[PDB]
DNA sequence: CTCTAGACTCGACCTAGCAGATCTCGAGTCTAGAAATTCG
DNA sequence: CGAATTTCTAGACTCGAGATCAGCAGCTGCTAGGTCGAGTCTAGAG
């Protein structure tokens, strides 16, 4: 029987919004290492993966590994009525049929239990590759989202261009053109309010702003977002889940059509 | 349609050969119609279709008429140059373009403006834009330029684009020519009638205009009654009454007075009377019954224009003074003279006697018995009430019970099935149509005897107008009786002659109101007259001719005659929750007086489920 | 070659807010003595005037007179993407159809520059009839915003009566009638509380309430509004932009017979 | 000459919005004892009663007991003009059909006056029987505010099975069932968190949650609900209006027979 | 013998449709913009 | 105090029913159906 007590339920709470608009069904690979999640997006374009170490949990123990599925949509509506400073004690029995909620209160005066119906999914595992990237960018995550919705007004395609002194965010729409560049600043002691880009080889790609808007949903996970880019490689947008874990995104680059011809 | 090309052209080419037609049209209008004549044959169709269509600005982009060409536009500019299809051109009228304008782009134009609630319904948006006419104090704020509505219509045209419309003159002249042709389709083979047009109906070209003015109004008032908006009708009817008042002293109606009653059918006063007649039901429905009482009084002063009108006003006074404006002292005076007026007869009057009986029995008028001692009587002998059953929806189980199929029907088959198995196979129904059909063939040339003025006024007439009026018979009182008594003495074989002959002599030839389907087979008709003969139908027609206005129908619905066994089974279809009207047996009483076989057929309310109970 | 740099970019942000929807297209007339904007609405009903001086600009130079037409909506899309504290670096090139909008970071870390297409309007030499107004009312902008907004629901027009005892706002509708009047401030020395009224002769006029909402969008610009009236003269609403200039709202009175028919 | 002067305008603000969604018109039974409202709902299912003691008003007077039928819907919009801290001055005069509302700013610098139109409503009186109940609980208002809402996601028919050790406010639906059980608390220093229950006989009945959501609109009025129940007797939901009045709600229990159908 | 309330009846009273396709439309539903709120 | 969160509100999209149109129906009177005030029958009390 699996029990996971998490003092910081807010971290668990705010995960679901990022996965709502892009994921509906998923499987939770649960082991003694912690909580794992891999699920291809509904549109079969971008890949979203989640990992949590067990050591982050206040209480955690899992005798036998389980891969079980629940609709993401249902669980967030349940988690809607919960508060941010509560104590949660995620618990699941061996025979995977229901999920019990052990919601607690900071004053330990009000407790509420809810029961979730589980469902079965086909465990489709895809082996992601691990490799070095050409241009890797770490920069304030809140700033990254702020850039996106400006360029969304112009078009749905931002030219990623790792340059000598930052990036060359360029949106090309029918109404006009939007070019945004940020100076590479590292002298700031506050690493959260700083950008660091490592140079291996310049590489230029373009991505659909539709997924970037969905990817920016995870902005308050961490104050900074790390972007790793490489030639003919899916986009990497990673969010560190404090010390609890990490959350990174895949999105295959669009094939550059021969519009010049 | 090839029908429309031949039809309108036939109308024109037939109305041409009338020297009065040219007499009542100016040389200008003559040039107009000739310049229609020289117009392209394929260019005729565009004006033909639009003429018999609503008068409103329409975009040719909306139009889809294809049988001329997908690109018949050159015909459009040609006919525009002809001076008929007023194109976008002179269009400085915001209301009309708003009418052309459709709601979606109307909503868009609302969006680009600031007006209050730019999401409403069609008309109030229209007059909201019309409130934008109230300006020239904020438009004159800088440079004067009062054409704010001009800007509105400019952007509307930018939204709308092109349109066309017909000038009033051509429409007016073709309206006049068509009503002249009508005078109270090309496939129709008209009868063997030649022509007898002698006297002109009207007296002046000015007089006919007022009919054209009135006819438009009369149709307008007709629509007003189907709206609930008689309030606008009265004001123009007041003007029409004022138009009457102005033209009350006009000699044109005196010649109509000189005209026979079948020519009196339409008269300046009479039109105005019928205008004022609708005014009464305008008045009564809005519950101004007292004026409606006043109108019929002045109506009752006049009797000449449609003598079959004074009786209606007698009922008007009774209805006005009973249902809502209970006023005894007049309504007794009314009902007395109402029962006495010659034009009040049959159902029109027999209802009044029962009305008199019903009124006198009431406690309200029970005091005035002394004024009710002149009551006539119509003692009846109600015909044997053969009360039958059968399924109702109606629904018939005709045929074997093994096949109780629905096959929706009417009350006829129920009795028909009952009577056909009663050895009365043939004979479907049709009140007095068949008797008129019998009357038609045998007396046709007597019916259509000519030489009398305006018997066949038009080039297309079938009935000589006076058919409705009793003066038809007075015209041929000697001629009819000679032919009438001959039929009375003619044997069955002789009847077959004039039936079959006139059936052929006037086959295809328009048979006025005569219905060929009444005689499904001509031999059947010849077999039908083999069952008929002499007094059987001769008694009927004696009643028919003079008492004609008030006796079109009411005869036994079913006719159910045995084809081979002579004996017929004439029937009045009836039943529970129903009864024979006062006039209804006036057919039967004299029918049974001549020993007709009318059989009152009541019908028990019997449903599909009901028979399963037994 | 025109180039004007204003430290307070929020002022340029606020001014578009009122003009964002009230006016759709206008000509940007610029002279060596300052900025002056003047155009008309699509309904030919109200006039907007700008009197931005050259003194208020931190750095100003306008080598030759320009009068250029640009879309109002396009500009508002750009003013929204700049913070309330960026330094505007407006720079317009001679007959080049390129407006250099640079949003300077007070932090001196981000660089924000934007250019937009230039359209072609037409000038109609709007006449400005200067005239004295019998009833002159100065009163705080915030209170003015309420009175116009509150009376919006009850009716569609207001009969303004310049009573010497205190101006009164009366509006009537199918719901009934409601009159609101104030008292001239005597002892409260605060300029954001004065209800001072200048009285020469009482005037009773009527105006459309569907526009007062639009004009009251300029409440963030200033704390006090000034309204002046007389017999048969347009409504004037003036906002004093510090020492930068004044903007005046023109509204010709509603005709008295419009309600009659 | 009816006059009622209450300083706390917000409480008068707070009472109207709760009444908007359930009643269209009602008869105002006012007396020297105070303001009393007895008005069964427009849906003809629930009953609402309101009584305001005269002494609760700062200044109350009532020469004659009037009973006016005023359109309930339009009242809030006029009230929406009133501020959260203005002194309301309810006042009626002779035989006219107008009610006088005056809103006074706390600084006495803004005086708002308004006038509405009275209608003729039949004075329909319904008998009010007084009796005891089976399950009576003093239970916090903000607590249930979610409870009606949270289980409104499950179904529309709760089966209350009040017992000796808390509540069993269960629900059910096609997606599942919502099962919340709150634990009875007595050792609480504050009375705003006490859920003390007095039991004589357990009762099991059923309601529709749609009304329950409507009955929760009066949450800002107080923080202590006096809802109670007995067998086959309509529900009572009473809110203490500070020391100003009492707001009671009536709703008959739903019969279990219709649930079978 | 007479006055009054309720059921059966009967006779008066009033109103829609014609004929299939065609737009046109008028309410019903959702989600983004607008805005209060509220907390560190 | 700013931003998120939630709510509110209006603008956009769906559907099914209402109105109209054209080449002909309207012959308008029988049929069905819902209605109403008066007449009539009966039961209980005087």
Please state the three-class secondary structure of C66-86 as a single string.
EEEEEEHHHHHHHHCCCCCCC
Q: Which of C77, C109, C116 sits opposite A183 (nearest CB)?
A: C109
Return the partners of chain C (3 or more C-beta pairs < 8 Å). A, B, D
Q: Residue A100's closest chain D neighbor by CA?
A: D179
Q: How far apart are CA A88 and CA A4, in angstroms?
A: 8
CA–CA distance from B443 to each of A218, B436, B439 (Å)? 101, 10, 6
Give the distance, in angstroms, between residue B294 CA and nucleotide F36 C1'.
Answer: 29
Q: How far apart are CA B402 and CA D106, in angstroms?
A: 93
Q: How far apart are CA B520 and CA C225, in angstroms?
A: 94
User: Cβ(C150)–Cβ(D79) under 8 Å?
Assistant: no
Give the tokens for residue C157. Answer: 């027009």
Chain C residues with CB-CB distance to D113 below 8 A: 178-180
CA–CA distance from B347 to each of B129, B355, B555 (Å)? 56, 12, 12
CA–CA distance from B30 to each of B16, B171, B307 (Å)? 10, 14, 39
A117 touches chain D (CB under 8 A): yes
User: Cβ(D48)–Cβ(D249) under 8 Å?
Assistant: yes
Write the CB contacts of B492 (distance below 8 Å, at least 6 apart in sequence): B529, B530, B531, B532, B533
Task: Among B116, B141, B147, B149, pick the best mutation site for testing chain C contact (most C Cβ within 10 A).
Answer: B141
D252: phi > 0 → left, psi -120 to 50 → alpha, else beta; which? Answer: beta
Q: How far apart are CA B211 and CA A178, in angstroms?
A: 75
C153 touches chain D (CB under 8 A): yes
Using a 10 angstrom Cβ sphere, with 0-12 exposed, 13-18 middle and 19 or more buried, the burial of residue D221 is: buried
A29 three-class SS: strand
Neighbours of B303 (CB within 10 A): 16
**Which contiguous run of DSSP H or E holds residue A138?**
strand A135-140
Q: How was this structure determined?
A: cryo-EM
Burial profile D44-67: b = 16 or more Cβ within 10 angstroms, e = fewer: ebbbbbbbbbbebbeebebeeeee
Give the distance, in angstroms, between residue B349 CA and nucleotide E10 C1'.
Answer: 22
User: Cβ(D157)–Cβ(D208) under 8 Å?
Assistant: yes
Chain B residues with CB-CB distance to C126 below 8 A: 142
Declared resolution, Å: 4.0
Write the CB contacts of C109 (distance below 8 Å, at least 6 apart in sequence): A182, A183, A185, A188
User: Cβ(B169)–Cβ(B426) under 8 Å?
Assistant: no
Neighbours of B169 (CB within 10 A): 13
Phi (first) and psi of residue A235, to 5 degrees: -60, 140
Cβ <8 Å between A176 and C111: no
Q: Identify the structural domains of chain B with CATH numbers, from first to last.
A: 1-88+165-182 (no CATH), 90-161 (no CATH), 190-371 (1.25.40), 411-593 (no CATH)
B213 beta carbon < 7 A from strand E?
no
User: Cβ(B468)–Cβ(B475) under 8 Å?
Assistant: no
Chain D residues with CB-CB distance to C145 below 8 A: none
Q: How near does any CA of chain C get to the CA of D112, in Å?
A: 6
Chain C residues with CB-CB distance to A178 below 8 A: 114
The C34-35 sheet, strands edge to edge:
C52-53, C34-35, C25-31, C66-71
C175 touches chain D (CB under 8 A): yes
Chain C residues with CB-CB distance to A180 below 8 A: 112
D74 touches chain C (CB under 8 A): yes
Give the tokens for residue C147. Answer: 């009175």
Give the distance, in angstroms, between residue D132 CA and nucleotide F13 C1'.
Answer: 54
* CA-CA-CA-CA torsion sign (C130, C134, C135, C140): positive
Return the partners of chain A (3 or more C-beta pairs < 8 Å). C, D
Phi (first) and psi of residue A40, to 5 degrees: -70, 145
CA–CA distance from C85 to each of C35, C52, C80, C105 (Å)? 21, 19, 12, 8
Q: How far apart are CA C97 and CA C70, in angstroms?
A: 10
B557 beta carbon < 7 A from strand F?
yes
The C235-241 sheet, strands edge to edge:
C38-40, C46-50, C245-251, C235-241, C224-229, C135-140, C197-198
Q: How far apart are CA B415 and CA B412, in angstroms?
A: 6
User: What's chain A's length in residues?
Assistant: 261
Give the tokens for residue D159. Answer: 């089966």
Q: Which of C81, C115, C117 sits opposite A150 (nearest CB)?
A: C81
Residue A233: CA count within 13 A, CB half-sphere: 21
User: Cβ(B585)–Cβ(B396) under 8 Å?
Assistant: no
CA–CA distance from C95 to each of C5, C69, C120 (Å)? 20, 12, 12
A105 touches chain D (CB under 8 A): no
Q: What is the helix, strand, coil percentage profile of chain C, to 5?
A: 15, 40, 45
Torsion of CA A92, A95, A99, A101, to 10 degrees: -40
Q: How far apart are CA B527 and CA B495, in angstroms?
A: 10
- The bridge status of strand A115-117 relative to strand D111-115 is unpaired
CA angle B601, B606, B609 (to 5 degrees): 160
Q: How far apart are CA A209 and CA B142, in angstroms?
A: 48
Q: How far apart are CA B188 and CA B508, in angstroms?
A: 8
| Last residue before each break in chain B (C–N > 2.5 Å) | 184, 393
User: Cβ(B592)–Cβ(B459) under 8 Å?
Assistant: no
Write the CB contacts of B579 (distance below 8 Å, at least 6 apart in sequence): none
The residue with tokens 């008295």 is C256
DSSP state of C133: -
B505: phi > 0 → left, psi -120 to 50 → alpha, else beta; which? Answer: alpha
Give the distance, in angstroms, between residue B120 CA and nucleotide E28 C1'.
Answer: 17
Q: How far apart are CA A198 and CA A182, in angstroms?
A: 15
Phi (first) and psi of residue A211, to 5 degrees: -75, -35
Q: How far apart are CA C129 and CA C232, in angstroms?
A: 13
Task: Among D168, D173, D176, pick the best mutation site for testing chain A contact (most A Cβ within 10 A).
Answer: D176
Q: How far apart are CA B302 and CA B305, in angstroms?
A: 7
Burial profile B566-592: b = 16 or more Cβ within 10 angstroms, e = fewer: eebbbbbbbbeeeebebbbbbbbbebb
Q: How far apart are CA A55 and CA A39, in angstroms?
A: 23
Q: What is the helix, strand, coil percentage profile of chain A, to 5?
A: 20, 40, 45
User: Cβ(C159)–Cβ(C257) under 8 Å?
Assistant: no
Q: Identify the structural domains of chain D with CATH numbers, from first to last.
A: 1-256 (3.70.10.10)
Q: How far apart are CA B131 and CA B124, in angstroms?
A: 10
User: What's chain B's length in residues?
Assistant: 614
């Amino acid at each position: 029987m699996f029990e996971a007590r998490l003092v910081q339920g807010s971290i668990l709470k705010k995960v679901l919004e990022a996965l709502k608009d892009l994921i509906n069904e998923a499987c939770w690979d649960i082991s003694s290492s912690g909580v794992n999640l891999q699920s291809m997006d509904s549109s079969h374009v971008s890949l979203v993966q989640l990992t949590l170490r067990s050591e982050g949990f206040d209480t955690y123990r899992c005798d036998r590994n389980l891969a079980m599925g629940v609709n993401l949509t249902s669980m967030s509506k349940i988690l809607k009525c919960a508060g941010n400073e509560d104590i949660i004690t995620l618990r699941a029995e061996d025979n995977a049929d229901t999920l019990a909620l052990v919601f607690e209160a900071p004053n330990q005066e009000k407790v509420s239990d809810y029961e979730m119906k589980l469902m079965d999914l086909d465990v489709e595992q895809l082996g992601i590759p691990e490799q070095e990237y050409s241009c890797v960018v770490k920069m304030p995550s809140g700033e990254f989202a702020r850039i996106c919705r400006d360029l969304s007004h112009i078009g749905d395609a931002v030219v990623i261009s790792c340059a000598k002194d930052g990036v060359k965010f360029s949106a090309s729409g029918e109404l006009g053109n939007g070019n945004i560049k940020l100076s590479q600043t590292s002298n700031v002691d506050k690493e959260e309010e700083a950008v660091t880009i490592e140079m291996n080889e310049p590489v230029q790609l373009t991505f659909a702003l539709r997924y970037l808007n969905f990817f920016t949903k995870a902005t308050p996970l961490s104050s900074t977002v790390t972007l790793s880019m490489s030639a003919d490689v899916p986009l990497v947008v990673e969010y560190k889940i404090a010390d609890m874990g990490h959350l990174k995104y895949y999105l295959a680059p669009k094939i550059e059509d021969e519009e010049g011809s | 349609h090839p029908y429309y090309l031949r039809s309108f052209l036939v109308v024109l080419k037939t109305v041409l050969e009338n020297e009065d037609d040219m007499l009542l049209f100016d040389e200008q209008e003559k040039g107009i119609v000739t310049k229609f004549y020289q117009l392209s044959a394929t260019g005729q169709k565009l004006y033909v279709r639009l003429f018999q269509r609503k008068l409103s600005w329409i975009k040719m982009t909306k139009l889809e008429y294809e049988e001329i060409a997908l690109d018949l536009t050159p015909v459009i500019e040609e006919l525009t140059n002809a001076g008929f299809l007023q194109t976008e051109s002179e269009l400085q009228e915001l209301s009309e373009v708003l009418e052309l304008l459709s709601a979606p782009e109307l909503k868009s134009l609302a969006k680009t403006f600031h007006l209050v609630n730019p999401n409403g319904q069609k008309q109030q948006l229209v007059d909201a834009f019309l409130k934008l006419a109230k300006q020239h104090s904020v438009c004159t704020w800088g440079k004067n330029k009062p054409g704010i509505g001009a800007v509105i219509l400019k952007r509307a045209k930018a939204l709308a684009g092109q349109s066309v419309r017909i000038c009033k003159g051509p429409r007016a002249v073709f309206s006049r020519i068509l009503l002249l042709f009508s005078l109270t389709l090309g496939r129709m083979e008209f009868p063997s009638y030649t022509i007898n047009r002698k006297t002109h109906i009207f007296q002046d070209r000015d007089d006919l205009i007022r009919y054209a003015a009135a006819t438009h109004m009369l149709s307008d008032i007709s629509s007003a009654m189907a709206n609930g908006n008689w309030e606008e009708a009265k004001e123009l009817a007041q003007c029409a009454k004022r138009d009457w008042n102005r033209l009350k002293n006009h000699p044109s109606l005196r010649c109509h007075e000189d005209l026979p009653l079948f020519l009196r059918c339409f008269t300046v006063g009479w039109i105005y009377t019928r205008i004022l007649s609708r005014f009464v039901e305008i008045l009564q429905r809005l519950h101004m019954y007292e004026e409606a009482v006043r109108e019929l009084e002045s109506l009752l002063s006049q009797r000449i224009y449609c003598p079959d009108s004074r009786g209606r006003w007698w009922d008007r006074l009774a209805l006005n003074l009973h249902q809502h404006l209970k006023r005894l002292e007049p309504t007794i005076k009314c009902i007395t003279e109402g029962l006495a007026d010659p034009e009040v007869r049959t159902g029109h009057r027999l209802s009044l006697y029962q009305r008199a009986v019903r009124l006198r029995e009431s406690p309200s008028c029970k005091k005035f018995k002394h004024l009710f001692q002149q009551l006539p009587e119509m003692a009846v002998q109600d015909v044997k009430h053969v009360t039958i059953t059968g399924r109702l929806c109606f629904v018939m189980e005709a045929g074997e019970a093994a096949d109780p199929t629905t096959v929706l029907c009417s009350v006829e088959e129920l009795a028909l099935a009952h009577y056909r198995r009663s050895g009365f196979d043939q004979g479907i129904h049709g009140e007095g149509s068949t008797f008129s059909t019998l009357y038609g063939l045998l007396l046709w040339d007597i019916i259509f005897m000519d030489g009398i003025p305006d018997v066949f006024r038009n080039a297309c007439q079938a009935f000589p107008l006076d058919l409705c009026t009793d003066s038809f018979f007075t015209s041929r009182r000697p001629a009819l009786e000679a032919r009438l008594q001959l039929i009375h003495d003619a044997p069955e074989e002789s009847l077959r002659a004039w039936v079959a002959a006139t059936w052929h002599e006037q086959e295809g030839r328009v048979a006025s109101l005569v219905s060929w389907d009444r005689f499904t087979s001509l031999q059947q008709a010849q077999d039908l007259v083999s069952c008929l003969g002499g007094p059987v139908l001769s008694g009927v027609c004696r009643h028919l001719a003079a008492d004609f206005r008030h006796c079109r129908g009411g005869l036994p619905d079913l006719v159910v005659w045995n084809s081979q066994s002579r004996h017929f089974k004439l029937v009045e279809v009836k039943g529970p929750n129903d009864r024979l009207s006062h006039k209804q047996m006036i057919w039967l009483a004299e029918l049974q007086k001549l020993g007709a076989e009318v059989e009152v057929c009541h019908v028990v309310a019997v449903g599909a489920k009901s028979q399963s109970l037994s």
